[PDB]
Swiss-Prot record, chain A:
Source species of the chain: Vibrio cholerae serotype O1 (strain ATCC 39315 / El Tor Inaba N16961)
A GO biological-process term: protein secretion by the type II secretion system
UniProt function note: Core component of the type II secretion system required for the energy-dependent secretion of extracellular factors such as proteases and toxins from the periplasm. Pseudopilin (pilin-like) protein that polymerizes to form the pseudopilus. Further polymerization triggers pseudopilus growth.
Record PTM: Cleaved by the prepilin peptidase. Methylated by prepilin peptidase at the amino group of the N-terminal phenylalanine once the leader sequence is cleaved.
Keyword line: Cell inner membrane, Cell membrane, Membrane, Methylation, Protein transport, Transmembrane, Transmembrane helix, Transport
Record has 4Fe-4S as a keyword: no
Included range, full protein: 35 to 146 of 146
Lineage: Bacteria, Pseudomonadati, Pseudomonadota, Gammaproteobacteria, Vibrionales
Gene: epsG
Family listed: Belongs to the GSP G family.
Protein's name according to its UniProt entry: Type II secretion system core protein G
Localization of this protein: Cell inner membrane
A Gene Ontology term for the protein's cellular component: plasma membrane
Induction context: By cyclic di-GMP and VpsR.
Membrane topology, as annotated: Single-pass membrane protein
UniProt subunit comment: Type II secretion system is composed of four main components: the outer membrane complex, the inner membrane complex, the cytoplasmic secretion ATPase and the periplasm-spanning pseudopilus. Forms homomultimers. Interacts with EspL.
Length: 115, 112
């Protein structure tokens, strides 16, 4: 059957959130010269990280709040990334790598498929 | 620069929101707003042709203005893709480099 409102809305939420997250990460790097490491994580965007300590952490962080994905799971983050300098993604409805339809992985590297 | 980066990020943010809204309009109504109906169609239910299944309260809370105070541009069908949604950058003109570069749905990958 043709996609309906809910499925489309979830995909769009995922795209919106990944864009916002990468925007925050890019600003973190603009201030600090490097991206948060995988271990420091997306949490580095809301709370000043350690190991290593950032050189110029913005008062108030880089994002107002970390969103959860359309299935209630934290977005995923890798630095250095496998698909780009940073990977920012949701594994979709199946919560596992790969898949298709609602289970499709939506990432900063494949945004074009879901725009 | 923080300001220049902020501007770029707003443009990307708005284009993604505008295309999301257009896609949802298409999903509801089977067609995109015509170029003439424009982005206003996402906030006020258009006429001629009046949509078959318009969403109560529209598709976007408010139309954003681009970082330099200009309206985002919309073409349907587009020249670069099925629909074109874009800002003409700081120079307000097609083409340009730096702060003047055109940011659209077709090249968001270069500004993500
Ligand atoms: Ca998956
Ligand atoms: Ca331009
Ligand atoms: Zn790519
Ligand atoms: Zn689209
Ligand atoms: Zn980026």
């Amino acid at each position: 059957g043709a996609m309906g409102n809910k499925e489309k809305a979830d995909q769009q939420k995922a795209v919106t959130d990944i864009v916002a997250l990468e925007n925050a990460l890019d600003m973190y790097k603009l201030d600090n010269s490097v991206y948060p490491t995988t271990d420091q994580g997306l949490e580095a965007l809301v709370t000043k990280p350690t190991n290593p300590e950032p050189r110029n952490y913005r008062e108030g962080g880089y994002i107002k709040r970390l969103p959860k994905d359309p299935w209630g799971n934290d977005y995923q983050y890798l630095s250095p990334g496998d698909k780009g300098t940073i990977d920012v993604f949701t594994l979709g409805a199946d919560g596992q790598e790969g898949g298709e339809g609602t289970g499709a992985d939506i990432g900063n590297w494949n945004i074009q498929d879901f725009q």
